[PDB]
Design a protein around this ligand. Structure first.
Ligand SMILES: N[C@@H]1[C@@H](O)[C@H](O)[C@@H](COP(=O)(O)O)O[C@@H]1O
Length: 235
């Protein structure tokens, strides 16, 4: 069934709450974490880095990797995760899609199998401005598992700034789908700023439609939404 909301003043305070909750899940037996990228968990990550948490018997799973990038590429999500978390607080094993996979359909099948092998205890998520979840854009099937995503033109244009040559900018990603993500025992979603207010309301109040990827979270048995006052204006 259910979705608890914690409303908070701001991002910093929502990030402290997320930290406290993470630490409890871990003390109560969580071993596999699904992780988030983007701006939303950056302060939660700094807090973890400076904390006494120890992920050395734990496994982490990220949603996404860019096709064509290695883990050492500065533009990769593997590298993002290293910088913001793994260098300071390594896991037993941290999984991301292999963006260098020879057979994209084989890597997608592989990632599903890793999910089956390490089901996620706690998944951290952000939300997109159009209610996208990971790289799953409106119209994505609620049945989707790991799959090849063509990046939005806004994403390619944004990421283009970071590559000397245009022929080197990823146009695609290997991404956990909506059914993939929904398999977590517990989901903690964080949303801060007015830019998220509309996606937040649609996730909570709108119908369950592929038009709002996050609306599937309405059907998860254990979703915890942490939202600052502005992102929660609608709920
Ligand atoms: N990079 C991100 C996703 O990984 C993220 O969860 C979401 C919101 O991004 P942010 O947390 O920067 O607002 O949209 C993009 O696709």
């Amino acid at each position: 069934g259910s979705m608890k909301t914690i409303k908070v003043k701001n991002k910093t305070e929502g990030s402290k709450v997320a930290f406290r909750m993470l630490e409890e899940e871990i003390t109560f037996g969580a071993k596999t974490l699904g992780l988030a990228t983007g701006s939303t968990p950056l302060e939660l990550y700094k807090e973890i880095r400076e904390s006494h948490l120890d992920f050395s018997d734990m496994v982490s799973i990220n949603l996404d990797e860019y096709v064509g990038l290695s883990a050492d590429d500065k533009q990769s999500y593997a590298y993002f995760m290293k910088q913001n978390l793994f260098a300071a607080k390594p896991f037993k094993k941290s999984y991301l899609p292999n963006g260098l996979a020879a057979d994209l359909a084989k890597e997608t099948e592989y990632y599903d199998q890793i999910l089956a092998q390490y089901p996620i205890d706690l998944q951290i998520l952000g939300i997109g401005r159009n209610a996208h979840i990971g790289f799953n854009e409106p119209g994505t099937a609620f049945s989707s598992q790991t799959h090849l995503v063509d990046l939005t033109p806004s994403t390619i244009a944004a990421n283009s700034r970071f590559f000397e040559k245009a022929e080197d900018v990823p146009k695609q990603a290997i991404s956990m789908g909506l059914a993939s993500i929904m398999s977590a025992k517990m989901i903690l979603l964080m949303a801060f700023g007015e830019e998220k207010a509309e996606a937040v309301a649609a996730m909570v109040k709108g119908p369950v439609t592929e038009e709002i990827p996050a609306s599937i979270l309405q059907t998860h048995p254990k979703v915890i939404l942490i939202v600052d006052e502005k992102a929660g204006a609608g709920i």
